[PDB]
Design a protein around this motif. Structure first.
Motif, PDB file in Angstrom:
ATOM      1  N   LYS A 149       0.815  -1.206   0.000  1.00 40.09           N
ATOM      2  CA  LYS A 149       0.000   0.000   0.000  1.00 40.09           C
ATOM      3  C   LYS A 149       0.850   1.258   0.000  1.00 40.09           C
ATOM      4  N   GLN A 150       2.066   1.203   0.545  1.00 40.15           N
ATOM      5  CA  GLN A 150       2.982   2.329   0.397  1.00 40.15           C
ATOM      6  C   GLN A 150       3.375   2.520  -1.053  1.00 40.15           C
ATOM      7  N   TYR A 206       0.778   4.092  -3.421  1.00 40.13           N
ATOM      8  CA  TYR A 206       0.720   5.547  -3.405  1.00 40.13           C
ATOM      9  C   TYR A 206       2.033   6.147  -3.866  1.00 40.13           C
ATOM     10  N   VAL A 218       1.516   6.063  -7.506  1.00 41.50           N
ATOM     11  CA  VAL A 218       0.658   7.190  -7.857  1.00 41.50           C
ATOM     12  C   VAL A 218       1.414   8.488  -7.646  1.00 41.50           C
ATOM     13  N   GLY A 219       2.262   8.534  -6.616  1.00 40.09           N
ATOM     14  CA  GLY A 219       3.210   9.627  -6.493  1.00 40.09           C
ATOM     15  C   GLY A 219       4.165   9.707  -7.669  1.00 40.09           C
TER      16      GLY A 219
END
Lengths: 428, 428, 428
Positions: free
Chosen positions: A303-304, A307, A310-311
């Motif tokens: 999950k890091q 993102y 997505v980052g």
């Protein structure tokens, strides 16, 4: 020299480039770091060990001297395969970071090169102003020696002369700075540099921006490094997905073990058990391990990295909106600089007609020699900002081709086909 | 204040400085991190353990309560000795990174100090313009009240007056920003600052650049941090060379181990083997381990740090060409800024002659009071760009000495021996 | 569009913001990384193992096939509790880093918005210059076709016309750049944008700075991130303080262990000892470990993080003097920008009167049509630098509010209540 021999010394001797060429050699070598845990791990290990009991365990003391050879192997661990694929793509990034720095050298050489030819010409400008405004001083002084002007118009015209010094000294200083912008990028003090051929220089209209930008999305290096960063951080997802997956590694540990007793409980019957045990063992097999539940640590890292992807997927779009701005910048810089030249080439035709009205107006007598030399300086003010517009056109082609990413030594040649006869950098 | 008390408050109270001074203390403390694994590792351990058999191994269950004291020691591992040598050099870097930040505080104080005296004088300029262009307005109004001008020449002269308000307000605002650039660097609002003594200010010709740059290469800090950058990554090769070299460490693990049974196989004859075993052992000896073949991981890290050294070797030559452009920039700034002064020192002598052509021209009546005050403003325009050129000469001495690295509180004093009588910072 | 629909597309589609929004989601997810070692560590392990003796230990060989389920738990380790608190505060940092980037979007939307309406009006300016200076050309040409001017006075006037091309092309180039500054921040080409309604726009006097800076210190985001940076490094001390503290972790390792012999010493009496030993064990209990003396590693890391905290405590004072400079800067920018407006609004009233002296002057005949259009371009010069001052007032409100940190979509509305009727971005 011509710009190629300026660049070919710069290509071989740029410390901004050879550093990135080293990091491009470092990142490709860093793949061999990543592929190496997939290769075996052969290591020798030896021990001296003296146990010392001090209780009910006293009397059992032993010089257990053991030497062993270990070999482990990543049989099945998809993270190392992912970290291999991470490191290849990060090396795919760092090759592009080099591919920028070719073009960054190609751009900033010609930028530093044409800033010499700017400052060579400003040196030719301002010494034609010092032949003019000193001549203005050398007659406003020779009017005051007669009586035509007040002492203000002397001490003004000296100040208008001494401003010419505080411009011409800066011209001689921006000459040496531009030379040392150029030695900074190439490597040497350069005595003469090839001036611009005005005859073989054309104001070509560039390609339309709808064709440029789709060509830019295939080639441009801020965008391409941002593509591969997205390609990098997508595998950073699948690395964290490989904490779910088990770790099967091989066991191969071979070696001696000499175990010789000492102490008070050695004194005894010894029971065919208490001898100087001189042994050796080779443990082969496999080590399987599956992380079932790490408190959701692995799910957190998944999950890091989602993102973080997505980052990173914004950093494509951060760059992919930036290339569109950068490509349309340089395409609308050169369309400025085409019209800029067709202004400052006309501004030459003014200051060439205005000068030649003075030379004819001085040969017949209506205008004086200082209205000649002012209009001479008016001509060279055109011919800086002519040449400065001629360089910023020839720069902004490279600012296109670097923002296209098609910049190479061929667009450099289209510069250097226009640089024919040399001019020097020596303040006379 | 004089510049020293501005600096001596800034030296004791700069958060840009003291953060580096804390990091210079953090880097030297990080050496003690490096020398610490060479020192022993004394650590106490303890275990409670209840084995539970559930098979053929059921019945043999025990409260194995064991407490042990451990000590290890870096007997032979050249990487820790290298990491000691790295961290001394890396703190040798960070001492120089501090040594920049002394001079950076010396320069930027003098930069922010002389930007106050600039902005004070622009404030004294623009109120001498607002005494002028108001009287320009305040007579075109009285020409309009009579009929000498159109309404355009009033509403223009109001606009030329309101531009002076839109500059004198910015002069007051760039005053307070300059005070707050100074409070940012020192710590306080400073009421009066020492103006420049024009009598003890000289236009000294600097030392030649062939003497400067060879003195720069012995001292200059961007270069010196890049030398020690090279010196740091050279040993990073030899750290990676210490993955080849073996790891000899010491074993000292001593402690109790009480083993008290439970279960169904505890019920038995016990064979003088099955008692509540209450033991204790002290293991002394050495731990030797040699990585033979880590899949070429170690060789790759050597080959990584080799090209990483070449990148650091290029970062020396990056900076070693960047010191030359920096040193010659300041030496060709100060040679400009001397001539810039002798320009604007003449521009005072122009404007002081033009002012006195007005004060004598108004005392007899040929020129009016507004043609005086315009030429009064023409004087103070000279006396900014005089004084500003007086500051940029005195700044570019420090841009020399900081780019020499010889900048200290002695070159500061040569500034402060020229800052004698104070002038306030309060807009009247 | 009005600025809100420009912002509400920018709020949903900023690649700079959504990047930081993901990093704000990264650091909050990174908390679950920190709290996860406090959660259990359930992992399944399995082994195949073939021992191979080759000495006195030859003949004893076995297929020790063992599978084991492991569970460990952070019973007592205050570093993980600190690393949880470290990560929450670093997430408290990274939430503020998002809160900057809301306002940084709000500002740079409005900044790139008002730089379109700058460049739209410069486009309206410079075509009114090309409606002027072409008429200057187009009658100096018709003076020359009759004989009133020299060829210098045409080829100068052509060059003054071609400079107007070399501005109006750049005005059209800066139009598309400003559109693409806006597409870079919002996402689209925007056909029309709401120009500034001058009637419902006021020159408000701002709040005094003694209230602003105290309201800044409660709110401003550079400063608030620096406080939480200091709040981060204080716990970085209390992390390294928890290397002093012991590490109590739980042992739960359960599993089978099947040990089946092979070899030459298997042939024997077997003593009710040498069978296919098919076993299984469950170890429950605790693991206690206290670092007594790590060579002063732990004390050094405390002493490292102490000086690192002082560096962070200086980074507060770095920012806390910076916010005092920054807040006073924008407050002294807007005080400049109000007086800038009441300059350039008066400069309209001049250039409105100077135009109306031409329209009344051309209707009666004293001034010509080119002195009209030159004074029309004098008007539109005033109407840029009014509108630009009308934009820098409205930007420096936000430069207050962003450096206050009170910037939101409500200050944006106070902009957008002044942006009423749309004007386009298409060069006609």
């Amino acid at each position: 020299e011509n710009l190629m021999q300026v660049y070919q010394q710069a290509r071989l001797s740029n410390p901004e480039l050879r550093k990135s060429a080293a990091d491009r050699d470092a990142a490709f070598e860093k793949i061999n770091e990543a592929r190496s845990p997939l290769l075996p791990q052969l290591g020798l290990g030896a021990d001296y060990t003296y146990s010392n009991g001090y209780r009910d365990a006293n009397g059992i003391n032993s010089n257990a001297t053991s030497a062993s050879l270990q070999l482990t192997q990543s049989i099945f661990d998809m993270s190392k395969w992912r970290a291999l694929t991470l490191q290849e793509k990060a090396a795919g990034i760092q090759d592009v970071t080099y591919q920028t720095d070719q073009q960054t050298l190609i751009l900033n050489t010609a930028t530093a090169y044409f800033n010499v030819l700017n400052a060579i010409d400003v040196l030719s400008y301002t010494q034609a102003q010092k032949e003019a405004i000193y001549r203005q001083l050398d007659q406003t002084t020779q009017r005051f020696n007669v009586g035509l002007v007040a002492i203000t118009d002397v001490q003004n015209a000296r100040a208008q002369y001494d401003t010419v010094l505080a411009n011409e000294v800066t011209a001689r200083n921006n000459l040496d700075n531009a030379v040392e912008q150029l030695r900074q990028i190439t490597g040497n003090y350069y005595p003469e540099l090839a001036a611009l051929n005005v005859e073989n220089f054309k104001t070509d209209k560039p390609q339309p921006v709808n064709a440029l930008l789709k060509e830019a999305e295939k080639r441009n290096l801020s965008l391409l490094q941002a593509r591969l960063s997205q390609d990098l951080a997508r595998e950073q997802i699948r690395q964290a997905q490989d904490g779910h997956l088990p770790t099967l590694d091989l066991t191969a540990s071979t070696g001696i073990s000499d175990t010789s007793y000492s102490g008070s409980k050695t004194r005894g019957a010894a029971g065919t058990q208490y001898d100087d045990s001189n042994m050796g063992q080779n443990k082969v097999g496999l080590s399987f391990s599956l992380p079932i539940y790490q408190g959701g640590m692995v799910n957190s890292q998944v999950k890091q990295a989602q993102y973080n992807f997505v980052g990173a997927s914004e950093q494509l779009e951060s760059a992919h909106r930036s290339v569109v701005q950068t490509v349309r910048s340089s395409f609308n810089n050169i369309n400025a600089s085409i019209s800029s030249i067709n202004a400052y080439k006309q501004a030459v035709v003014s200051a060439q007609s205005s000068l030649d009205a003075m030379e004819a107006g001085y040969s017949v007598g209506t205008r004086t020699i200082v209205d000649v030399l002012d209009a001479t300086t008016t001509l060279y003010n055109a011919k800086q900002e002519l040449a400065n517009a001629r360089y910023n056109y020839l720069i902004n082609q490279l600012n296109i081709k670097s923002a296209l990413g098609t910049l190479n030594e061929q667009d450099l040649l289209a510069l250097n086909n226009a640089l024919s006869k040399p001019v020097s950098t020596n303040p006379e």
